[PDB]
Structure formats: C-alpha cells, structure tokens
Amino acid sequence: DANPFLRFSNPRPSPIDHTPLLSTLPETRITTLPNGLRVATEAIPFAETTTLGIWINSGSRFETDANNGVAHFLEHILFKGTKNRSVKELEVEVENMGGQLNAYTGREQTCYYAKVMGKDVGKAVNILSDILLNSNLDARAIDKERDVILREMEEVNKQTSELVFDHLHATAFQYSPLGRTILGPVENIKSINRDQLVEYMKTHYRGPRMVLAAAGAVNHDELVKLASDAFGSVPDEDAATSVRSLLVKEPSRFTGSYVHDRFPDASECCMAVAFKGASWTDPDSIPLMVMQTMLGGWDKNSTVGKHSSSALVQTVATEGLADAFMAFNTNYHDTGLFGVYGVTDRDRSEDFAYAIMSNLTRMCFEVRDADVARAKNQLKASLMFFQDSTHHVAESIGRELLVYGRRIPKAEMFARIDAVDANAIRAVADRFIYDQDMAVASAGDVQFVPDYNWFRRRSYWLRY
C-alpha cells in the first residue's frame, strides 16, 4: 500500500461527467452554395496539416443490376488523368503538395479526400474539383484496369472478413438494394464502358448530395470562395431523383437466413451472426452503440483478456474459443446490422457460437449498472479519440451531414449517451434481439458450424 501510488485511482466503475471537455472543442461552420452543395469546416486552433474532400451521398445501393460496380470502378479510373492535367502532371502536382489522395466507396456513401498541409488547401480544392468534374475516362485505361480487376476476380483475392460480410449482406438483405456487393459481378466488370460511368456521374453526383468538409488548418470564408469558384458547375437536384424518393421507391428488406462457403482445405473458420439493427435516424441507435461497447472485442495478441470487464471477452479469452472477434454495429438509411464476427477453428465453432448467442440473449434480462457506466465512459473516451485526428474529424463532419442532415454538437451526443441506463439497454435488447430471426454467414472450414434451427432456438429462454 504505497501512499503516492494508491491515490486517485480505483477499479470500481462510476459515472464520469465529460462536460469540461466541451469548452475547448471547436465549432463547425456550415454554408450552402446555390446548387445545394454544403461547405462545412471545423478549425483546430493550432494545426499545421489539413484534410479535406468531397463526401457524396451515393454508392452501390443506388445502382441497378445492369451497372453494378460502376462506383467502385470510378475510383479505379478517376485518377488516370483529366482534361487539363495528364497522368504525369497530376502526379507531380500531387507530390509537390507533400500529401496523399485517397478514395473510399461504400454502399450508401462515397468519399474522395486529400491530406495536405495548411498552405496547400487551395491547390487541393482545385485538384479535387478537377478530378471530380473534368476527368478523361479514357477507354484504353479502362481496358488496362479491367484486366487487373478480372485477374484478381479469377484468383479469388479477397479478405476473409470482407467475404463473410459480403455474404451476410447478400443473404440478409436479399431482394433489396443493400444486398449487392460494391465490386459487382464478373459479367458487369467484363461488359463496362465509358457511358455507364458518365451516366452514373451525371445522375448521382448532384448538388445537395455532396458535402465539402475540411478540418485542421483551414479558414472558412476562404474555403467558401474557393468552393464557389471550383464546384459551381455542379448541377442541382431533379425532384424525381432525390435521396428520400429513391429510398422510398426501393426499400430494404431483412430475411432470416443462413449461408456458408465451404472450402476443402481451409485452416480457419470465420462466422458472423447478425440481427436487424437500427437506421441512422433511429433514436435507439445510441443504446446500440453502448451495447456494441459492452460486448467489445479481443484478439489473441492481448495477454490480459481474462481480466476484461466484458463477459463475452472473458469467456472467449478464458476458454480459448476463438483467435479474434469483434462486435459490430452497422447503420444505414432505413435499416442496419448488429452482431458479432469472429475467427475460430472447426473444433471451436459450436462453443464460440453458443458464447455469442448466450451473451446476446442475456442482455435482455441481466444488465448491471457498473457495466453500463463503464461502457458509456469507454464510448465517450473513444469519441474524444476521434477528435484528436483531423481525418476522423473531417470524416465525422461529412458523414454526419450526409446521414443526419445536420452537424450534431458534442454536447448533444454526450447528453444522449448519458441518458442510457440499464433499463434502456434491456428494452433495446428486448426489441432487437429476443426471439427474432437472424442472419448467419460463414466461410472456410465450416462443416461443424450449426445450422439455422440451432441458432434460431437460442434467441429465447424457456427457463423464464
């Protein structure tokens, strides 16, 4: 019992008031161009590097069966030259800035962002608008990229978690727009050309579906002037092709189902169990974030898994039921996914599945106040760690503007998180998990993974 070492710290979880953090947090300033494009900035007081880019409310959900995979091919082709810059000129102009260009295509969201210093914001705006609005889309480069994509299709070159989550989306949201994969099938890749790319760009990359977000060392009004100079030729909405109308026309559907992808000689077994989650606008999405923190995650590179405050991590680490796992919480415009993904062996598949199902169903009856308080503190601390990085602040601005229609102040997010208690967690788990159909996807050595009726019976307890 050292006097200097055993003060101010103890392992008993208590609620922590995060209010004095918000005084020093920067504010976000949002303007709107006449075409509907929003420019939002958050100025960090002493920063040197800045990240910035365009967040587009579009993705593989808003495609058809004829042009599936046009949005992923766009990020393959959009950096091969423009009408004003060639390949080498674009290369030297990017590398003169001392930074990076990166793109990410999702199902409901696309990003084209850059990471530069504070003195190269205007050049980054100019090159981003030039890439997005004035690209060549050369047929020769399309033919060169198609061979690479087709070779990696025929080699079956994919991450295992990506394969599992794609199978889970395709079986959970079957006969829905969200069921398609981002990369698309072999036939659409083999039969794609310039005109489908052009029509996708002209249809979906409109004014009010795009947000110009920057964070770090950036001035607001100067960025507004640059954005009005560069992105002013972006067309506006047609009323028949708004995001809300497209959502209403082709909604999402969830079906309880099973899929596995069995290989003859595979060392690992990767499985995911998912329930129908919440959308971005659902008020119960915040308790789903708290529950995702409560379940937690673990990998075998950590030697203190047995001392974890999460019961699922405790069981998996103590019994050695898996190599790695992580609970997920995906949100979409009208639906979502919630559950546990993990990597294990064929001899531990049933035990890992029972651990997952028993830890999910227990949250409908047995929730302790200490675990809720601990998970809320972990959630707020993880939210503060995203504020430390400019890239996460810019991504947060773009995503929050695209999916909520506003920028949520950190005080409101903290007040929403602080309103979740054990009763709310019990009620949300009772609504979303208890005696409901689920979707199960698997890959690899999956001969000992239980079938759908085994999973379905363990959503409820007959003992109560």
Binding site: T24, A47, E75, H76, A427
Partner: protein, 441 residues
C-alpha cells in the same frame, strides 16, 4: 422510457450549454523542461486537443542486451503493465479500462518506451498507472512464463516480412557495438528465458539519469508537482556500449522466397544531435523514394524494381540512411546495378523542382508525425532522451533552408565513406561481393 426524439431532430430544449467558450492561448505552446532531484527529466508540451498522452522513455533496448539477456526487450514489451507491488494485473487492467484509456509498450533499437494515452479529465489516473507500472513492476514467474508463446509467435510473424530481416542484418553489418545487436530476435532465442533474466535486464537499464518522462496536453508545473513523489528512481548508470560505423557485406539465405531483396545503406554522421545532417538525411531519403503511391490504384512500373523502400535512422551519435530494393531472383544483379547508379545520379546534381518535392515530402512526414497527441509525446520523449532537447521548429527550418548545393555536397561526402550491402533470398545471381563495393570508388 428511453429517448424518443429522432436523430435528425435536435434534442429537447433542456440541453444546457454548461461549457463556456473562450479563451484559446494567444501564442503557440512550446516544450518546457525541468529535471527532478533524482535526475529524471520531465518534458511536457500543452496542447488544445482533449487527449493527454504520457510516455516514459528509458535508455536501453537492444543496445543494452547482453548475450545472457538476449530478446529481453520484446518480452518486456509483451510483459509490461502486469502486476505491481500495489496492484494485481486484474486491478490494473480494470483501472485502465474504466476510464477508457489505452496503454502500450514499445522497444526500439536504443530505447524502450512505455505510455498511457487518456482523456484530459483522467490525466492523474494515467500518470499514477504509468508510474506504478514502470517503477513497482513485479515480473512474476508464471505471468512471464505464460507469455513466451505469444512473444515467440509475434517474433515469427515479424520475421516473415523480409524487410524486417534485411533491417536486422543491415544494423548488424553496419555497426560495431550496441547498435549492431539484433532487436527482432529469432523465436528460438527466448527458449530458456525466465523472469530472472527479465529482472536482470530491467536492473541493467534502470537509472534516474536514463529516464525521460514526456507528456502532451498537460500543465508542466502540475506534472512536476505530481511526478515528484513517484519517480524516485535509484540505480547505477551502467556504461553505454557506444557504436561506430564500419560497414561491410553480409547475405541471408531464404530457400523458398519468391523475391530477392537488396539493401544499401550509408552512415548519417552526427546522429540526432546534428540538426543539419538529420535534415539532409531526411531529404536524401525523400529523394530516393522513387515509387511513392500518392493516389489510389497508381500503376508505376519499374523495369527491375519490384518494390523500393528507403530509410533514414538517427541515433545518439550516428545513424543510417539508404534504400532496400526487392526484385526477381533472376534479376538481382540488375537490381544492384540500378541501386548503385541511382546514387551517382543523385550525387551529380539535383534540380530545384526535385529538391522542392523532396523538401515538401520530408516536411509533410515531419509535421504529420507530430499531429496527434501520442505522436507528439513520443517525439518529445525521443528527442529529449537522445539529444536533451526537443524542437521540431528547428528541424523544419533546417529542412526549409536546404539548398541544392547542401544536398549535393552531403551526398558527395556520404559517397566518400564505406557502403553496406545486405542480400536476402536465394542468391543465384550475386555477381561479385568485392566489385560492388568498388563501384562507388
């Protein structure tokens, strides 16, 4: 009931703006340094970020490893933040997880770092946990024994990368002394390892003059007042096995490697103490980086270089700068030829656009490495441990003030020293060991 307000809607009118705005500090914050009575240097910088980082830097690493205590830095990396004299492993893990804080241990070539990153509201907890975990650590027999399989599998995972192996052989070949000791050791080295070996290594590296407490995002006076009764370190300053560049040539055989790697390196004279030489080494590393992908799905194609990775290391008194290039097993002689001819192409002269490009690349890496609170705290700690002070503004000013004459003369003086050749894989086309050393002449 729970909240029923939709997320696009704002929350209820009882949403108190309890935080009051104003004021940001009018000046850019700077690093303050103040030693303690035991001799511990405390170096902290205040930051507007809401994350406080606290890193403890201890001199040592692979340089302080004897043949008795080989591989002890990796095991100390894995076995840190376990049970102490005041806390068990369970209590310490729960205390870290309660406030949502993360801890790490990291072993370098000439140092070992321990750190806890946390919220600014919980900086005292982070400081006390880090102080107890480094000072009062009980390296028990069973906890050290149960981690050796994790250490061995992590070492085997690290040696699967040929770049890590080529880096180890380069550091051994270029140096004589503590800097030539292997850091990422073979897993068979940690076979007969016990907690007494770890205790011996920790006792050899621990002294109050070899320890730097760095921080980011905290008041300096409060940090010194609270670290006064915690960092009462007592120990003997063991002699440092100082190192000198000697160069040479060595080869490592991999019978089932589909790519043959070639490593070339030169001594960065002066080390981290010389700001100008460090800036010139950073610029040369940026110049040699031929294929840096700055855009998604870029399709750069070299005739012989499958992959090119330059490096620049800065230690206390010396360092390395050079390049490691891979290639086909049947194309290794041309890989050596292109790697050799590239440095005379650099020594002959650099254009103003190329110099501006490399200076912007190096300045971007330098100002990106300190953009986060843990990265800033790590840079402060590494600089104070190596040279006694931290100032990246001087490093940036030296990078900005570099002319083409400075870089040309630096590379000309660098080519007048000994080279270093390291080859990985199956060497069925290694032309001559003596002639490639005489190509620079």
């Amino acid at each position: 009931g729970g909240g029923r307000v939709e997320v696009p809607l704002s929350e209820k009118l009882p949403a108190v703006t309890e935080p009051p705005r104003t004021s940001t500090p009018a000046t850019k914050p700077i690093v303050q340094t103040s030693s303690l009575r035991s001799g511990v240097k405390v170096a902290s910088i205040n930051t507007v970020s809401p994350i406080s980082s606290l890193v403890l830097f201890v001199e040592g690493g692979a340089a302080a490893e004897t043949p008795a205590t080989a591989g002890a830095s990796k095991v100390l990396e894995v076995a840190a933040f376990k049970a102490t004299a005041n806390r068990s492993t369970f209590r310490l893990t729960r205390e870290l997880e309660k406030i949502g804080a993360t801890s790490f241990a990291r072993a370098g070539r000439d140092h070992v770092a321990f750190g806890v990153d946390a919220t600014r509201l919980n900086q005292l907890e982070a400081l006390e946990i880090l102080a107890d975990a480094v000072v009062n650590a009980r390296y028990t027999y069973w906890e050290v024994r149960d981690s050796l399989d994790a250490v061995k599998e992590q070492l085997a995972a690290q040696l699967r990368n040929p770049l890590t192996a080529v880096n180890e052989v380069l550091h051994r070949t270029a140096f004589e002394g503590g800097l030539g000791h292997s850091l990422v050791v073979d897993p068979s080295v940690v076979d007969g390892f016990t907690n007494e070996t770890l205790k011996e290594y920790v006792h050899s590296i621990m002294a109050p003059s070899r320890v730097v407490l760095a921080a980011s995002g905290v008041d300096h006076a409060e940090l010194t007042a609270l670290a006064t009764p915690l960092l009462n370190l007592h120990g003997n300053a063991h002699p440092a096995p100082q190192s000198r560049y000697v160069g040479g040539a060595m080869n490592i055989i991999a019978p089932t490697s589909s790519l043959t790697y070639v490593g070339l390196a030169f001594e960065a004279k002066g080390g981290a103490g010389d700001i100008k030489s460090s800036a010139a080494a950073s610029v040369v590393k940026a110049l040699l980086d031929e294929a840096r992908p700055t855009m998604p799905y870029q399709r750069k194609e070299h005739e012989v270089f499958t992959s090119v990775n330059p490096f620049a290391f800065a230690y206390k008194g010396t360092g390395l700068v050079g390049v490691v290039a891979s290639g086909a097993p049947g194309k290794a002689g041309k890989v050596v030829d292109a790697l050799t001819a590239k440095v005379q192409s650099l020594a002959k002269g650099v254009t103003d656009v190329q110099l501006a490009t490399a200076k912007n690349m190096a300045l971007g890496e330098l100002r990106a490495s300190v953009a986060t609170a843990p990265g800033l705290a790590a840079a402060v700690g590494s600089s104070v441990l190596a040279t006694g002070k931290f100032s990246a503004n001087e490093v940036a000013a030296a990078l900005s003030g570099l002319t083409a004459a400075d870089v040309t003369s630096y590379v000309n003086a660098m080519i007048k020293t000994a080279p270093t050749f390291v080859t990985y894989g199956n060497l069925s086309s290694l032309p001559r060991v003596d002639s490639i050393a005489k190509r620079f002449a």
